[PDB]
Amino acid sequence: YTNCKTTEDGQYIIPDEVYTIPQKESNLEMNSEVLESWMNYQSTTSLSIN
Amino acid sequence: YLSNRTNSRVQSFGGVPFYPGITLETWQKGITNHLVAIDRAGLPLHFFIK
Numbered sequence: 001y002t003n004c005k006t007t008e009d010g011q012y013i014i015p016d017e018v019y020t021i022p023q024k025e026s027n028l029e030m031n032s033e034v035l036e037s038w039m040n041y042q043s044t045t046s047l048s049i050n
Numbered sequence: 051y052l053s054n055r056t057n058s059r060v061q062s063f064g065g066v067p068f069y070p071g072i073t074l075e076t077w078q079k080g081i082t083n084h085l086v087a088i089d090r091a092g093l094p095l096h097f098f099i100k
């Protein structure tokens with residue numbers, strides 16, 4: 001770290017045997033969904049006789 | 051039978067480390083440094099050996 005370097009956008013101190021070339025970003029979100037619902041019903045009889 | 055399906059994919063190079071809730075602005079204003087070579091052109095190095 002003799003002639004102690006620093007990255008161009010100075011926010012680090014690289015050692016003087018390395019050089020940097022700055023770039024990036026990347027991300028990706030994704031999601032899914034699934035629902036359901038069911039029902040039913042009834043029946044009836046009746047007879048009143050005589 | 052409900053089914054959402056969401057995707058998302060940012061791919062930035064290069065500004066401030068991206069994050070979903072970021073405005074389309076604070077990205078820009080934060081580009082002061084964080085510049086990146088988006089395009090480049092040069093010569094074959096044998097040309098420079100003269």
Ligand SMILES: *[C@@H]1O[C@H](CO)[C@@H](O)[C@H](O)[C@H]1NC(C)=O
Nearest residue numbers: 032033035052053054055056
């Ligand atoms: C997701 O499903 C909900 C119902 O739960 C629906 O209102 C909405 O439009 C769907 N899409 C998004 C992006 O929320």
